[model samples]
Target: QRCGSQGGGATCPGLRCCSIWGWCGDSEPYCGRTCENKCWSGERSDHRCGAAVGNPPCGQDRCCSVHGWCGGGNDYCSGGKCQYRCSSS
Candidate 1:
């Protein structure tokens, strides 16, 4: 699970490690590419949006619009198909 503890005036940044070669199906126009999650490995390790292998998984709604529980890599919605946030439009 993506663990975090932001201070006041800081909500979910709404972005993730959107490198063309970062991970599979990570080709979005990452909104907050500069605002990464803490302790994550990516272009912006200190303050970018992405998840690691062991640490907690970041929330989709916080960065990339995830759904269901977000503790493992399986929680991330990479492919065009996703379980949650399927029809929130």
Candidate 2:
């Protein structure tokens, strides 16, 4: 989905480019709660975007980062805390 680029001479008005960790971001609106959030959506199994911490494991021997959302919101697992909020602005 990189570039969100459409060939020719057309431009996308809603080109959404984003990344995970702040120091690991080159996309717009990096890590947080929503749109700048931790969870990909308002569900637990949704930890799509965001940094890879190192923990529970997304696969065998390769777990989801400790700060990864196990179910919903960026529940920074290490601290067991989350700033779960969704914005429409």
Candidate 3:
């Protein structure tokens, strides 16, 4: 089933990860840095990263933002606002 905000609040079943585009799957494309929910880094509740996820580090090349989400780009990797894996740029 579809998941995330775009999916009308629906959630993924089992160990599937919710992608940023609201799709559900168990691959890197779905469970990687852009995962919107239910990531493999931890339990379903821990998918948001940062303190909420017990400060679990994000996937390779991704940053854990102060707001508890994981993703690329300056919004997540620049400055010291990131909780982990801040980019050098």
Candidate 4:
């Protein structure tokens, strides 16, 4: 079954891991940097990025902060503060 954002936050069952694409499985594709849950490496990839797994880009015009939160304010868009998609301002 699908999981993560595509599945309304649904989690994988048992040892299965949720892939960044939102599918459930038990392999590298499902448990690597793109993995959304139950990663084999025990890393957190629950859709959030920075200070953790830096996959899954933020929404349109939103910025991924160094601390791993998505927003548009200076705290998120200022130079060097955002990990991805920082505003040119």
Q: Largest TM-score belongs to which candidate?
A: 3
lDDT of 4: 0.64
User: How do all the candidates rank in terms of TM-score, highest first?
Assistant: 3, 4, 1, 2
- In model 1, how large is the Cα lDDT of residue 16? 27
For model 3, how does the per-residue alpha-carbon lDDT over 26-87 read when each residue is reduced to its tens digit? 56788887788756464333446765555554654566677888777888877875665554
TM-score of 3: 0.45
Residue-wise C-alpha lDDT for candidate 2, range 1-89, written one tens digit per residue: 22212223221122121223222221234322322222233223454322443221121111133344433223432233421221211
| Candidate with maximal lDDT | 3
Measure candidate 4: CA RMSD. 11.9
Where is model 1 poorest over a 10-residue stretch in terms of lDDT? 18-27
lDDT of each: 0.29, 0.26, 0.66, 0.64
Q: Which regions of candidate 3 are displaced past 4 Å?
A: 43-89
- Per-residue lDDT of model 1, residues 46-77, tens digit only: 32222443223233342222333333232344
Better of 2 and 4 by TM-score: 4
Q: In model 4, which runs have C-alpha deviations exceeding 4 angstroms?
A: 43-89
As for lDDT, the candidate ahead, 2 or 4, is 4
lDDT of 2: 0.26
